């Protein structure tokens, strides 16, 4: 999820852009034209607030560089299944309906008056005929990270932003479990993340192994996928892959074959499920403190793996060249008992 | 090369690059070797945890499994959250998430013999019958309403013992692990998703008593990796002045940061039973002198 968010990030500073001190404070505030293009929730907590956004779920860049947003045009008060993409200028020049507004199965507006968004910061009911455009889904303004926070319509803006930022700091555990409650944008956000392999053609698996897999295509071509095991991640954590397929199954194309870090059956899983209780207990949970049962400690429920990295080099010098050698002056045999011949 | 200060674990693999084997290397190097050390960390005190609703926290204490409160059927809880922080922060969503998680975990079966209840009119026809450890998903801005939760909480499947733990409101009767007697009032319980942040405790904890000293500034190194001491800001000097504490400030500025002979003598005195000798002239002052004397400004001392 962190990698996907970084790939989807929208920076506003750096070379060729304004600085922190010269940039005005107003630019850091929302604009009525941000709906559908840049999420208003996700944002760094630090001083770089408002200068780093994120694409919306359905946002697509036009060939010139103006962000677009899908819409279905109402011709005569009847919803149209076909959809078109509108930019800011064209969106302003038209009437955009509300997705949550009830609509009959035949496309007829049950309500004569439907709320609507207007030129700028204007919303007002209008007859159910002049309305021209309607949104696609209620989730058209949220970011990818914010789109997977259940009951987001009940929290506060600051709390929602804090949770969204926190979601990008999880640590891959040893035994992940899929959440019991979570939006439907979990598996899709994992398949597109790239950290999970997937079959290209519908074939039948001949044999599987902890280190590699071999799938037989229906055309008679054998293919093999190699899965890296315990390779240090770019930030110090571990990354692994465990195939979740059995020997002798005709796996269809597009079906996940292995689960990467923070995954469980081809869907994101950044944590576990714990039985919580809400009550002050002897002040040990005082002022945001937390109490944990030893069952978690003794069952590896929240056990993680971290891999360090060190390197040494022997570079030539004017006084000579350094060489790595088992022997070392004035050192007891016990100290170097671990070094090998080389 | 030696392991830095505060690292341990197994050695999983060693990569060595040699110029003899025709391996590209940075100019002026012959043998660069890297070693990977992997350590398994178990969650401990001083670790951050937080849900998906932005409610951070730290592990105040890890009580034994025999001390945590347990449900009426003997199922000890795994974590306890404070309540005063919910209404002030105004993040009531997590309560609904916990209720829904408990409902999904326990499994439900909404009555339909007499017909779909009015509150269950909009529920999908395939969502009226669930199984234990079921999976549910509420898309943002379109999910179960309050009435849906009210109805679901009233039809949860009973435990294998034949009794239902939680009430319609969602609260339950517990039993104190220490006193052994039930609490006077019910409490809310349920399953809530918990992540693990990257701000571990092992990285933060660090100590330094005596170690390598910088050669250019004559000051102890900095950073946990280098095994260096902590910084001492000027606000700390202001605070020390405020209390009127003088000898402490003198030590902090002279006998533990700069004075070489001072450090040696005080260390030896502590090793023995002798009293700590008074500090001397800090290296900073002597450097300032020998530098200001370079601008023809005769800086005398006037010891008299």
């Amino acid at each position: 999820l962190s990698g996907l968010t970084h790939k989807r990030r929208l920076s506003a500073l750096g070379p060729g852009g304004l600085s922190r001190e010269r940039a005005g404070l107003e630019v850091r505030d929302v604009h009525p034209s941000h709906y559908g293009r840049m999420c208003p929730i996700e944002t760094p907590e630090g001083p770089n607030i408002g200068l780093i956004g994120s694409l919306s779920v359905y946002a697509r860049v036009n060939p010139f560089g103006f962000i677009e947003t899908p819409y279905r045009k109402v011709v005569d008060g009847v919803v149209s299944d076909e959809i078109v993409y509108l930019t800011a200028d064209e969106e302003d020049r038209h009437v955009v309906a509300q997705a949550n507004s009830p609509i009959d199965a035949d496309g007829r507006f049950v309500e004569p008056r439907v709320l609507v968004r207007r030129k700028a910061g204007e919303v007002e009911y209008v007859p159910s005929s002049e309305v021209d455009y309607m949104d696609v889904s209620p989730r058209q303004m949220v970011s990818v990270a914010t789109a997977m926070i259940p009951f987001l319509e009940h929290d506060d803006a600051n709390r929602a932003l804090m949770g969204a930022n926190m979601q990008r700091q999880a640590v891959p555990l040893v035994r992940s479990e899929a959440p019991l409650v979570g939006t439907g944008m979990e598996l899709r956000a994992a398949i597109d993340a790239g950290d999970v392999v997937v079959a290209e053609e519908s074939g039948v698996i001949e044999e599987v192994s902890a280190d590699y897999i071999t799938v037989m295509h229906d055309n008679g071509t054998r293919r093999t996928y190699r899965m890296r095991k315990f390779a240090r991640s770019n930030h110090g954590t571990c990354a692994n892959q465990c195939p979740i397929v059995d020997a002798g199954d005709r796996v269809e194309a597009g079906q996940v074959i292995a689960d990467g870090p923070c995954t469980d059956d081809g869907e994101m899983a950044l944590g576990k499920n714990l039985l919580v209780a809400i009550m002050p207990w002897e002040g040990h949970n005082y002022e945001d403190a937390i109490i944990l049962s030893n069952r978690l400690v003794e069952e590896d429920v929240l056990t993680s793996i971290h891999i360090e990295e060190h390197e040494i080099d022997a570079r030539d010098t004017k006084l000579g060249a350094e060489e790595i050698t088992r022997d070392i002056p004035n050192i007891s045999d016990e100290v170097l008992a671990d070094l090998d011949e080389r | 090369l030696k392991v830095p200060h505060g690292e341990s674990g197994k050695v999983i693999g060693i990569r060595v690059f040699s110029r003899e084997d025709e391996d590209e290397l940075p100019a002026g190097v012959n043998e660069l070797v890297r070693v990977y050390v992997a350590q398994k960390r178990k969650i401990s005190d001083g670790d951050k945890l937080a849900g998906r609703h932005g409610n951070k926290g730290v592990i105040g204490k890890i009580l034994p499994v025999e001390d945590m409160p347990f449900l009426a059927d003997g199922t000890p809880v795994d974590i306890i959250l404070n309540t005063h922080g919910v209404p002030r922060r105004m993040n009531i969503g997590q309560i609904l998430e916990t209720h829904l998680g408990w409902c999904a975990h326990s499994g439900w079966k909404v009555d339909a013999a007499k017909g779909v209840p009015d509150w269950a009119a909009r529920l999908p026809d395939e969502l009226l019958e669930a199984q234990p450890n079921a999976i549910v998903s509420t898309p943002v801005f379109d999910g179960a309403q309050e009435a849906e939760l009210q109805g679901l909480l009233s039809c949860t499947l009973p435990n294998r013992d034949g009794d239902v733990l939680v009430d319609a409101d969602g609260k339950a009767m517990l039993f104190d692990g220490r006193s052994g007697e039930p609490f006077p009032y019910p409490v809310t319980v349920g399953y809530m998703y918990i992540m693990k942040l990257h701000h571990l405790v092992d990285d933060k904890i660090h100590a330094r008593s005596t170690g390598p000293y910088s050669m250019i500034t004559q000051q102890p190194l900095g950073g946990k990796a280098q095994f260096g001491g902590q910084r001492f800001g000027e606000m700390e000097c202001w605070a020390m002045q405020a209390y009127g504490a003088a000898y402490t400030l003198q030590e902090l500025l002279t006998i533990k940061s700069d004075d070489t002979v001072g450090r040696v003598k005080v260390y030896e005195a502590i090793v023995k039973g002798e009293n700590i000798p008074e500090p001397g002239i800090p290296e900073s002052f002597k450097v300032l002198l020998k530098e200001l004397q370079s601008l023809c400004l005769n800086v005398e001392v006037l010891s008299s």
């Binding site: 996907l4 359905y58 697509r60 299944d81 993340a193 796996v251 269809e252 194309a253 | 999976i135 379109d142």
Partner: peptide, 25 residues
């Protein structure tokens, strides 16, 4: 409506249908 072949089954509190799948992220 699971676009991917073998994703786990998790019924949802669906009330409205989105006429287009999420584009390639």
């Amino acid at each position: 409506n699971n676009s991917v072949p073998g994703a786990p089954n998790r019924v949802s509190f669906a009330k409205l249908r989105e006429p287009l799948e999420v584009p390639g992220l």
